[PDB]
Amino acid sequence: NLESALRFGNPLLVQDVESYDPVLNPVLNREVRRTGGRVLITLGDQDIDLSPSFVIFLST
Amino acid sequence: NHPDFPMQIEQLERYIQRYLVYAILWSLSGDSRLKMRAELGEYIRRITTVPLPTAPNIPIIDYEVSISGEWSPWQAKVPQIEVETHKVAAPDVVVPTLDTVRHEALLYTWLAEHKPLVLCGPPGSGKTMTLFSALRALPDMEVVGLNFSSATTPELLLKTFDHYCEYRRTPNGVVLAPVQLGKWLVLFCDEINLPDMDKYGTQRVISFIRQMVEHGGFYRTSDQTWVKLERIQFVGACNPPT
Amino acid sequence: VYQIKVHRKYTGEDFDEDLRTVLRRSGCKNEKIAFIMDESNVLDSGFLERMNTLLANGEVPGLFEGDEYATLMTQCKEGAQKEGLMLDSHEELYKWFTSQVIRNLHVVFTMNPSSEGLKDR
Numbered sequence: 001n002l003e004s005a006l007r008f009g010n011p012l013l014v015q016d017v018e019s020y021d022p023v024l025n026p027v028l029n030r031e032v033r034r035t036g037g038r039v040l041i042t043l044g045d046q047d048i049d050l051s052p053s054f055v056i057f058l059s060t
Numbered sequence: 061n062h063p064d065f066p067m068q069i070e071q072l073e074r075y076i077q078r079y080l081v082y083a084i085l086w087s088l089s090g091d092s093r094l095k096m097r098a099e100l101g102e103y104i105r106r107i108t109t110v111p112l113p114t115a116p117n118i119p120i121i122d123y124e125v126s127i128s129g130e131w132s133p134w135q136a137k138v139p140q141i142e143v144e145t146h147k148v149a150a151p152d153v154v155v156p157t158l159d160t161v162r163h164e165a166l167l168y169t170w171l172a173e174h175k176p177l178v179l180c181g182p183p184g185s186g187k188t189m190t191l192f193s194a195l196r197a198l199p200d201m202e203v204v205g206l207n208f209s210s211a212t213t214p215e216l217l218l219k220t221f222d223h224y225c226e227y228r229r230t231p232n233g234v235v236l237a238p239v240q241l242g243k244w245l246v247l248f249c250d251e252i253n254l255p256d257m258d259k260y261g262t263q264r265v266i267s268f269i270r271q272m273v274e275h276g277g278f279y280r281t282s283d284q285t286w287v288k289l290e291r292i293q294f295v296g297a298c299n300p301p302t
Numbered sequence: 303v304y305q306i307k308v309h310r311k312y313t314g315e316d317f318d319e320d321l322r323t324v325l326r327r328s329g330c331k332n333e334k335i336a337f338i339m340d341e342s343n344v345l346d347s348g349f350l351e352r353m354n355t356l357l358a359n360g361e362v363p364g365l366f367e368g369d370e371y372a373t374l375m376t377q378c379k380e381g382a383q384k385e386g387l388m389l390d391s392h393e394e395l396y397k398w399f400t401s402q403v404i405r406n407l408h409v410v411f412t413m414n415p416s417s418e419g420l421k422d423r
C-alpha cells in the first residue's frame with residue numbers, strides 16, 4: 001500500500017503506529033534524490049519514485 | 061644458592077615469623093582498600109608479639125620480608141627507569157611503582173603455585189597491563205586473552221583449548237596439554253563477572269572454570285570422558301560486582 | 303559513510319550480513335569506513351553485544367565461519383598480495399585483517415540524552 005501511494009501520489013492514512021516500522025525513516029526525513037527528471041527514495045534495498053501529490057498521515 | 065652457609069635456626073624463625081605476619085596482611089586484607097588494609101595492620105600490631113618495623117606512620121604493608129629475615133621497605137626495590145622518547149604512553153611500557161611492585165610480588169607468589177586469581181578493580185587502574193607485565197616477566201608462562209561477554213559460554217573455552225592445546229592419551233587417561241612442550245598456558249579473562257547468570261542464578265562459565273580448577277580437569281562432550289588438565293592455569297580480572 | 307537500513311523485519315542475521323559486508327569493505331579493501339549507528343537502528347541487545355566484541359577486539363570471530371571464512375581468506379590473501387605482504391597460513395592473514403580493520407574501521411554511536419538509558423547502556 002505504501003508502494004501504491006508513492007507511485008500514484010495518493011494520500012495514505014495509518015491508524016496504528018505504536019509498532020513503528022522504520023521503513024518510513026527516509027520518507028519522514030524526505031531523503032529524496034534528484035537523478036535526471038526523476039525523484040527517488042530508497043526503501044530497504046529497493047528504490048521508489050516519488051509523486052508530489054503523495055502525503056502520509058500517521059495516527060494513534 | 062648458599063651451599064656453604066645454609067640458614068641457621070634463628071634466621072629461619074625470624075624470616076618465617078615476619079613472612080607469616082606479611083602473609084596475613086596480604087591475604088586477609090588483600091581484597092580491600094588501603095584504609096582497611098591499614099586498619100588490619102594496626103589491629104595486628106596491637107595483637108601480635110612478632111617483631112615489627114618502627115615506622116611512625118608507614119604501615120607494614122609497605123614493607124616486605126627479606127631473605128635475611130629483615131623488614132625492608134618496598135621503595136628500595138622500586139627502580140627509577142627512563143623510557144625512550146618514542147615509547148612514551150606506549151601500551152607495552154610499564155613504570156614500576158609501589159602498587160605495581162607489590163602486585164608483581166603477589167602475582168609471582170600466586171602464579172608459582174598456579175592458583176588462579178582475579179584482579180578486581182575499577183576500570184583502568186592498571187589491572188590488565190600490570191598482569192601482562194608480570195606474565196611476560198616470567199619466561200615459561202605464555203598468555204592468551206579471552207574477552208568474556210554477557211553471552212559468554214563454555215564453548216569459547218573449548219575453542220581456546222582446541223586452538224592452543226591438544227588431547228593426548230596417557231596411562232592415567234586422556235590429558236589436555238598445550239601443543240607447546242614444557243609451557244604453562246595462562247587463560248586471562250578480562251571480564252570474568254560480565255557473563256550473565258541464568259534464570260536460576262548460575263553462570264555456566266564460572267561453574268566450568270571452578271569445575272576444572274578444583275577437579276583438575278573437565279568433560280569432553282564428544283565421547284563423554286574425563287579429561288585431565290596439565291600445564292593449564294587461569295587468571296581472571298573484573299570490575300567490582302557493585 | 304555507511305548507515306545500516308533498519309526496518310521492522312531487520313532481524314539479527316541481516317545486521318550480521320551487513321557487518322560482514324563492512325568488514326570486507328574495510329580490511330580486505332584497505333578502505334577507511336565510517337560506521338554510522340543510532341539506537342533507533344538497534345532492536346535487541348545482540349546488536350550491542352556484537353559491537354562490544356568488535357570494539358574491544360577489532361573483530362568478531364562469530365561472523366566469519368565455513369565458506370564465508372574461506373571467502374574472507376581469499377579476499378585477505380589477494381589484498382595482502384596487492385599491498386606487498388606475502389602470507390600463507392590462516393592465522394597470520396587473520397591477524398593482518400584484524401590490524402587493517404583496527405586501523406581503518408571507525409564505529410560511531412549516536413544516542414539521545416537519556417541518563418537512565420545511559421546507565422542501561
Ligand SMILES: Nc1ncnc2c1ncn2[C@@H]1O[C@H](COP(=O)(O)OP(=O)(O)O)[C@@H](O)[C@H]1O
Pocket residue numbers: 153154155156157160182183184185186187188189190
Ligand atoms: N605502572 C604503570 N605503568 C604504565 N602505565 C600505567 C601503570 N599503571 C597504570 N597505567 C596506565 O593506566 C591504564 C590502565 O588501563 P588497563 O589496566 O588497560 O585497564 P583494564 O585493566 O580495565 O583493562 C593504562 O592505559 C596505563 O597507561
